[model samples]
Target chain A: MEALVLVGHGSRLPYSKELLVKLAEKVKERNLFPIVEIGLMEFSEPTIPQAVKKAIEQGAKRIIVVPVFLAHGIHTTRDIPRLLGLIEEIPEDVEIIYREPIGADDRIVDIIIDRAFGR
Target chain B: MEALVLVGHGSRLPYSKELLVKLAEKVKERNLFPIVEIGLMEFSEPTIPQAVKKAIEQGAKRIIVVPVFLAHGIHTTRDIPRLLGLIEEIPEDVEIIYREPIGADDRIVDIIIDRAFGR
Candidate 1:
């Protein structure tokens, strides 16, 4: 089965990583994936490799890496994938799919207006 | 007049910086502000100082710095404000309002579902 991993650009500060954990909890609450976990690019625990291994340990054949990023930047495109050592093709025992960042969705469009006007 | 400055955590990679500029374009296209500009914390052009100066030059008495972050962490709570050196009292020539990050909005709630289910 496919597992979900929310990857964040970890911060030196603790709160930043906590926020990611909270978001991951929300994702888990939805119960969409059999295995759901949080990963960090740096400066935090459960780094990408560790999280992926967690999924594998839990019997996940396919791993989906969803970047908790606002845009398809270097972290999403290069740094994260490089850190994960994800190849175009992996052995049949495991698979990895790197999803794009959450871009300017209409929901985000709504937020910009709400924020500026929320005054 | 009031101007809006969207702040981003600039990255050393070019694509990462370019992504922030693209988001700024979306914010501008919405036509919600008398003035809209993009700023970076570091490693990019139009740093916070430059963006704020641009707004001031354009006759903006009040400038709002809206962080383009998912949550308020050190960068949002400390680094950014420190960079701006915002004081409680100004010369009344200019006012700065630092807004919170775009966090856990219902829209973001919707996005998580969409992103995961968008298959």
Candidate 2:
């Protein structure tokens, strides 16, 4: 089955990680994807490489990696792509696709609007 | 004494609130300001008006309200300004100044760079 891996720039503070984890839960609740996994890129445990490996071991044939960042800044443009390129070292049995960052997206904008309007 | 109040878009997830609290601690550690207070704008307890009242009660003559948002989105542009306008009901003994959000700033870019470089 295909797996969705949501990656966030983790913080040393557990509270920051909690935000990403809760978001992952929300996505899973939608029941749109079969397997959903959340991982951190830095400043916390379960780095990107480890998360990907775990997904593959869990019998995932295809993986979609989403960055939970706010913008298409350096992290989205340069850093994440570099990390994904290294995924080739993993077993070729699994296919991986990296999606766009969440920032500046219409869906996120909708969320913000809802928050503003007390919806 | 002057006080700095950092207002964050609070989250239902305690983890999200923790992130903002930790950042407030970091700013305090810098010793940049005398009195630093953190509050939530929504989705959590200790809302903005309550936090401001507490700051004033603490003997703050001048108050700086900083919105802990990522960009000059609708929140920064419309919502926050509207809130500030309502602060006129506050006692004239204290002065208030609202600052810009954290996003699109060079300091934030630097922070992102540091995070990406594993610094």
lDDT of 1 by residue, B10-107 (tens): 87776556766776778788777899888888889988889988888888998888888887778888888887786312336788888878875656
DockQ of each: 0.47, 0.05
Docking class of 1: acceptable
Local error of candidate 2 at residue A67 (angstroms): 4.4
The sequence of per-residue lDDT tens digits that candidate 1 reaches over residues A1-81 is 888888888887776677678787777777778989888888899898889888888888888888888867677877788
On lDDT, the candidate that comes out on top is 1
* TM-scores of all predicted structures: 0.86, 0.50
Residue lDDT tens for model 2, A42-102: 7776788778888888888888887666535456566677777743256777777777543
Fnat for each model: 0.34, 0.01
Top candidate by TM-score = 1
The residue-level lDDT of candidate 2 at B54 comes to: 82
- Candidate 1 residues lying further than 4 Å off, grouped into runs, are A87-92, A117-119, B87-91, B117-119
